Amino acid sequence: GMNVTQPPVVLASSRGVASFSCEYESSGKADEVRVTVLREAGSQVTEVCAGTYMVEDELTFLDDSTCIGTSRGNKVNLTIQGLRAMDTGLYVCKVELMYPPPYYVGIGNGTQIYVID
């Protein structure tokens, strides 16, 4: 089907940088993949950042002001920077196989990110 795995807990650095991996297992023949980071507090859901990458590549597919994502095959590293204590929360990796059809979607269990000031 579509298992998305990410580490349950991570600690931001003193500079406000937190890194976690997100990995997927699937029967789909992934080529184009959309990875979305969702911050979740119960039913409160907010999109943090998102990027598209090509499975056969190996690159830095995401680099907005806040997230940096690198990808290799079915694994990605995600890094969120500029974190402060109030940004503490559950960050859920969502993965979509976007092309070719058929479409697949999976959601991870979430990485709880703790930030000390």
Ligand X SMILES: *[C@@H]1O[C@H](CO)[C@@H](O[C@@H]2O[C@H](CO)[C@@H](O[C@@H]3O[C@H](CO)[C@@H](O)[C@H](O[C@H]4O[C@H](CO)[C@@H](O)[C@H](O)[C@@H]4O)[C@@H]3O)[C@H](O)[C@H]2NC(C)=O)[C@H](O)[C@H]1NC(C)=O
Give me the residues that bind ligand X (CB under 6 A), please: 70-72, 75-77
CB of 23 to ligand X, least distance (A): 9
Q: How many CB atoms lie within 10 A of CB 94?
A: 17
Shorter beta-carbon distance to ligand X: residue 6 or 70 = 70
Shorter beta-carbon distance to ligand X: residue 76 or 92 = 76
* Residue listed under structure tokens 């911050």: 39
Shorter beta-carbon distance to ligand X: residue 38 or 68 = 68
Taking the C-alpha atoms of residue 117 and residue 28, their distance in angstroms, rounded to an integer, is 42
